[PDB]
Amino acid sequence: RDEVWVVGMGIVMSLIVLAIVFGNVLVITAIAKFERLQTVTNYFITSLACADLVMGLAVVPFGAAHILMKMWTFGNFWCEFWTSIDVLCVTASIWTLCVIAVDRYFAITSPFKYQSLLTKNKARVIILMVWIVSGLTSFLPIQMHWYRATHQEAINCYAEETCCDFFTNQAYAIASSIVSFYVPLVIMVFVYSRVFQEAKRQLNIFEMLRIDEGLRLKIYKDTEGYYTIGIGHLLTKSPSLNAAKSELDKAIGRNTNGVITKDEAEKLFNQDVDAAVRGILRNAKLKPVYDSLDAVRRAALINMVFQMGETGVAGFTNSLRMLQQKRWDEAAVNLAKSRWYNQTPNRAKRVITTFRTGTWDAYKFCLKEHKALKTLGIIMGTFTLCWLPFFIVNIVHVIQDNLIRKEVYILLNWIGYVNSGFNPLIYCRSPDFRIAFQELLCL
Ligand SMILES: CC(C)CCC[C@@H](C)[C@H]1CC[C@H]2[C@@H]3CC=C4C[C@@H](O)CC[C@]4(C)[C@H]3CC[C@]12C
Ligand SMILES: C=CCc1ccccc1OC[C@@H](O)CNC(C)C
Numbered sequence: 267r268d269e270v271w272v273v274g275m276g277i278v279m280s281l282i283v284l285a286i287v288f289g290n291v292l293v294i295t296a297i298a299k300f301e302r303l304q305t306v307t308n309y310f311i312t313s314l315a316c317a318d319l320v321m322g323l324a325v326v327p328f329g330a331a332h333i334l335m336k337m338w339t340f341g342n343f344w345c346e347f348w349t350s351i352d353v354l355c356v357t358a359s360i361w362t363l364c365v366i367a368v369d370r371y372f373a374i375t376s377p378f379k380y381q382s383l384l385t386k387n388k389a390r391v392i393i394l395m396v397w398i399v400s401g402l403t404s405f406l407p408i409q410m411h412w413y414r415a416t417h418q419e420a421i422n423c424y425a426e427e428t429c430c431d432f433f434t435n436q437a438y439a440i441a442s443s444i445v446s447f448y449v450p451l452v453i454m455v456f457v458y459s460r461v462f463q464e465a466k467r468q469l470n471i472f473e474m475l476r477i478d479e480g481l482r483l484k485i486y487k488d489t490e491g492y493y494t495i496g497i498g499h500l501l502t503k504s505p506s507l508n509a510a511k512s513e514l515d516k517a518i519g520r521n522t523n524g525v526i527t528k529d530e531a532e533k534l535f536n537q538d539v540d541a542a543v544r545g546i547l548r549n550a551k552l553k554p555v556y557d558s559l560d561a562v563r564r565a566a567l568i569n570m571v572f573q574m575g576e577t578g579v580a581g582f583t584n585s586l587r588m589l590q591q592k593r594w595d596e597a598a599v600n601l602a603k604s605r606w607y608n609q610t611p612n613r614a615k616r617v618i619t620t621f622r623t624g625t626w627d628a629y630k631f632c633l634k635e636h637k638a639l640k641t642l643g644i645i646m647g648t649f650t651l652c653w654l655p656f657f658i659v660n661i662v663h664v665i666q667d668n669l670i671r672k673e674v675y676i677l678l679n680w681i682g683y684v685n686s687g688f689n690p691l692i693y694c695r696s697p698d699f700r701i702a703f704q705e706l707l708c709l
Contacts, residue, residue, distance in 0.1 A: 272334060279330035282684060286322030289690030290315045296702035303698055306369065306382035306389045307642070311693070313362045313393045314645070318686035321355045324348070326683050333676065338430035345430035346408055354397075354404035356653065356682070357446040361396045363646050364450035367458040370642065374464040380635040403445060413438040431672075439664045447657050451650060458643055465636050469626040471539060471565040475572060477632040478613045483531060485510055485524045489609055495524075496531035498572065499538055542568050545576035552576060555586045563589070566620040573613075574606065589621065598622045641695045648692065652685035 293315040297303045328348050332338055338345055372383050382389070407413050413434045414424065420433035434442075479498030485507065488494045493501045493510035501510040501517075507524075514522050518530055526534075546552045546567065556567055567589075570579045580586070582604070588597040598618045601607065607614040616628040631640045656678040663670035693699040703709075 276330075276334055279326070279333075282687060283322060283326050283330065285687040286318060286326060289687055290319040290322060292703060292706060293690050293693060293699075294319065295706055296699060299706075300698075300702045303702060304386070306384050306386060307366065307638075309386060309389045309393060310362055310366045310369070311689075313396065314359055314689060317355045317359045317362070318689060320351060321683065321686040325352045325355060326686070329680075329683070332430060337428045339428065340430075342424075342427055342430075348430070349432060350405045350408045353408070353442070353446070354401055355686075357400040357404055358397055359649065360447055360450045360454075360653070361400055362393070363649060364454045364457075365392055365396060366642055367454045367461065367646065370461045370639065371457050371464075374461055374468070374639075379468070380638070400446070403442070407438060407442065413442075436664045439660060443657055443661055447653070451654075454646060455650070458646060461639060462643065465639055466626050466630060469629055471568050472535070473633055474565050474569055474620075474626075474629055475535070475539065477629055478569065478573075478616065481528075481531060483526050483528065485514065495526060495534075497535040497538075499531075499534045538572060539568065542572040542576075546571055549576045549580055551580040551583075551586065555590050558590045558592070560624055562624050562626060563621055566617050569617050569620075570606075573610070594622045594624070638696065641692060644692050644695070645689055648688050649685055652688070653682045656682050 294312060297308045297312050297315075325348065328340060328344070329352075331340075340348070369382050369384060373379065373381055376383055384392070414420070415433040415435045417433075420431075423429035423431050423433055476497055481497055482495065485493055485495050485501065488498070488500065491505075492503050493507065493513075495501055495514060499517075501513045504510065511522070511524050514524065514526070517534065518526060522530075546556045552567070552571070556564055559567060567579070582601065585597050585600045588594075588600070598621060601614070601618050601621070604614075607618070619628040620626070631637055656675075659670075659674065659678055694703065
């Protein structure tokens with residue numbers, strides 16, 4: 267268009283190049299310097315951030331210059347090289363996302379649950395394989411000119427040193443699209459939906475209570491100002507910190523000084539959960555209700571006993587009677603008309619919803635590891651939304667042959683490009699990344 271558009275378009279493309287580079291240098295630097303972030307998952311995020319940095323340094327600037335100058339001023343060699351790097355970055359990105367998905371599946375299905383079954387050495391070998399293989403499928407069909415179209419509009423462009431329009435033959439456009447994008451995308455969407463199914467399915471009382479009670483390795487006052495530690499382990503109703511430290515030292519079996527380990531908090535929690543279940547089976551009012559309930563609803567009843575005690579929950583005569591008669595909404599009404607709901611409304615709401623539904627939908631993405639899984643699914647969904655329009659319109663115009671245009675192809679390709687700037691923002695969801703960024707940016 268006119269000067270006003272070229273300047274404004276020039277500024278916008280400069281900001282996108284700056285945002286992609288700064289953002290991805292930051293991500294790579296944070297994982298390179300902070301030991302806590304040196305995980306198998308973040309080695310794959312490093313693979314992803316490298317592809318995005320290469321996209322930002324070697325692809326997007328030469329593409330921007332091509333749009334603004336309305337020509338290619340870098341010659342036929344950098345044209346074929348540029349095209350290949352661009353193809354390599356998209357392929358390496360999507361295949362890395364597919365590896366993350368498969369790795370998260372094998373983790374969630376193992377006794378370890380949230381830990382990769384890979385060693386950091388094995389993860390490095392896989393990243394190297396993804397890049398070597400995607401580099402072979404990106405650079406060989408282009409340097410060998412297997413991609414080349416045979417119509418004169420394309421042929422003139424290949425010969426014209428100042429033309430760098432990505433004309434392909436239909437078999438390359440289909441073949442490269444499926445192996446580079448559609449195959450890993452379909453696998454990633456199928457495997458990661460199961461990851462999300464598994465996290466929800468494998469929710470249990472330990473995770474449910476870890477969510478509701480939280481974790482504190484140091485003494486704190488609860489809702490009622492009673493001294494507590496770990497995962498909702500009440501130490502004493504006494505208003506003395508010494509009394510609470512004595513009870514702590516007796517329970518743990520050593521001089522704690524009001525501080526316990528993760529191993530010690532987990533051990534107490536197992537005792538408390540086991541006492542809550544035994545208390546249910548011991549109590550004649552709770553045992554018939556517990557027997558009539560399903561696995562998810564039993565956990566909601568364990569949660570209540572863990573918080574208020576066997577005697578406390580046994581006071582809910584109407585609610586327990588209707589839970590037994592499977593009258594969930596009537597049970598839920600009576601449970602809300604209690605001191606328990608007024609004292610702890612967010613926790614009572616989740617327990618009442620679990621009784622109402624019989625599902626884990628209230629505890630959905632509440633655990634730190636499940637929020638980590640949600641973050642990875644956002645990375646995958648954003649990539650798909652940004653790249654799928656380009657790849658769909660690309661495959662449609664191979665069948666149909668017409669209405670492809672140039673202004674549409676470039677625009678949808680730039681939707682994909684702008685995705686390299688998005689992942690650093692999504693990593694801010696992780697508190698570990700948020701801390702690294704504020705440190706590196708000296709905030
Ligand atoms: C333009 C093309 C030719 C250059 C491609 C850059 C290559 C060399 C980059 C891109 C992604 C990179 C990998 C990103 C992730 C990791 C995990 C990290 O813990 C060690 C290094 C390792 C294994 C990197 C090695 C180098 C790598 C494969
Ligand atoms: C046929 C579509 C090109 C393609 C094939 C395989 C993998 C990725 C692909 O497309 C990425 C685009 O960003 C390339 N951009 C061109 C080279 C300007």
